[PDB]
Amino acid sequence: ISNCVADYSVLYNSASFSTFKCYGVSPTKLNDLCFTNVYADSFVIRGDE
Amino acid sequence: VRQIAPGQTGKIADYNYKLPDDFTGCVIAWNSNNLDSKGNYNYLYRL
């Protein structure tokens, strides 16, 4: 992901999701920062895993 | 049910019901599908 305007609040407010955990950052601050070397991983696993 | 906690995002916690950070008290939950089912359209929330 590169050279763009990201609006994470749509993602975390409009919850289609069951897990949303951020790690070295808080979800509230994500619309205030700028980012470097953004990447997205994606796969499918079992529910217990 | 995740969002009823101190310091948490979502839009239950952001648009509907917000706990403070210095919260003293308890939070109790239990599922109620036998009493809250059919097609039930009597439970609104804000978007």
Q: What is the Cα–Cα distance from B6 to B8, expressed in whole angstroms?
A: 6
Q: In a mutagenesis test of the A interface, which of B3, B4, B9 is the best target, namely the one with the most A β-carbons within 10 Å? A: B9
- Comparing alpha-carbon positions, the chain A residue that sits nearest to B13 is A13
- How far is the C-alpha of A21 from the C-alpha of A43, rounded, in Å? 17
Contacting residues of B for A14, CB less than 8 Å apart:
11
Query: Are the C-beta atoms of residues B23 and B6 closer than 8 Å to each other?
Result: yes
Contacts (Cβ under 8 Å, ≥6 apart) of A1: A38, A39, A40
How many angstroms separate the CA atoms of B19 and B13, rounded? 8
What sign has the CA pseudo-torsion B22, A7, A44, A42?
A: negative
DSSP at A29:
G
Q: Does A27 contact B9 at a Cβ distance shorter than 8 Å? A: yes
